[PDB]
Scaffold this active site. Structure first.
Site, short mmCIF file in Angstrom:
data_model
loop_
_atom_site.label_atom_id
_atom_site.label_comp_id
_atom_site.label_asym_id
_atom_site.label_seq_id
_atom_site.Cartn_x
_atom_site.Cartn_y
_atom_site.Cartn_z
CD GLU A 141 -2.24 -0.17 -3.41
OE1 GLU A 141 -1.97 0.86 -2.76
OE2 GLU A 141 -3.35 -0.74 -3.36
CG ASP A 181 -1.94 1.14 1.18
OD1 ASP A 181 -2.27 1.61 0.08
OD2 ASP A 181 -2.39 1.56 2.27
CG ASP A 203 -4.91 -6.48 -4.28
OD1 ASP A 203 -6.00 -7.01 -4.58
OD2 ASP A 203 -4.83 -5.49 -3.52
#
Length: 242
Positions: free
Chosen positions: A41, A11, A151
């Protein structure tokens, strides 16, 4: 012999406490010391932090700008051979499919990762991207052991309506009898950086030549800032090869 890897959406799009969180992720990777690490990310300043605090890993990136995925390879354990980036022509979020062919131990591996299209509204695009991943996993030779992890943003039981996984593509979490201790990698009740099974593992191999041994969550300890390393949980997986 055995192999181990960690897939994790660290993230990077959360700009708060990022340096401390980056140190958090690296501390986690140091504990388990996986042979491979699939990251999503990831951003350049975050990437430059991995080149220092995770120096024992060879970093391959899915892009150079914005945010992107990455595959880390344990030096002396995993040997790089070649990389490849299959694009998603219709992505609106710079998503793609990073492929890294390696030689681990004495077997040829095709390591893959991707950050499929996010949000519920872009369901159709996410499925078409998934089919590309699955299709790409078929293109590899039979001798090569293909392993995808990342993901997938798959939700609302999207998989079973698209036809389900191919007969030769197996979900690790499903292969292990669907354990509940690591079912949800995305959980707004447990995590508070901000439930579904977004992060998943797909693998294709000869019968028995790749048997998942365990699957666990990682990064479940809060840091000094009172936040977790990421809004996602990481997934540690170990497999046997014969």
């Amino acid at each position: 012999s055995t192999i181990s890897f960690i897939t994790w959406n660290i993230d990077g799009l959360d700009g708060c406490n990022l340096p401390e969180r980056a140190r958090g992720v690296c501390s986690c990777l140091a504990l388990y010391s996986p042979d491979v690490v699939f990251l999503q990310e990831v951003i350049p300043p975050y990437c430059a932090y991995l080149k220092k605090r995770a120096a024992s890993y060879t970093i391959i990136t899915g892009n150079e700008e914005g945010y992107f995925t990455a595959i880390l390879l344990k030096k002396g354990r995993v040997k790089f051979k070649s990389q490849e980036i299959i694009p998603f022509p219709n992505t609106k979020m710079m998503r793609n499919l990073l492929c890294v062919n390696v030689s681990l131990g004495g077997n040829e591996f095709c390591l893959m990762t991707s950050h499929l299209e996010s949000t519920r509204e872009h369901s159709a695009e996410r499925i078409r991207q998934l089919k590309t991943v699955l299709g790409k996993m078929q293109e590899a030779p039979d001798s090569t052991t293909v392993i995808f992890a990342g993901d997938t943003n798959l939700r609302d039981q999207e998989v079973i309506k698209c036809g389900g996984l191919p007969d030769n593509v197996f979900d690790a979490w499903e292969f292990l009898g669907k354990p509940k201790h690591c079912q949800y990698t995305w959980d707004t009740k447990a995590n508070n950086n901000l439930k579904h099974r977004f992060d998943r593992i797909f693998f294709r191999a000869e019968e028995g030549h790749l048997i998942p041994q365990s699957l666990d969550l990682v990064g479940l300890e809060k840091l000094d800032c009172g936040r977790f390393p990421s809004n996602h949980w990481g997934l540690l997986c170990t497999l046997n090869v014969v």
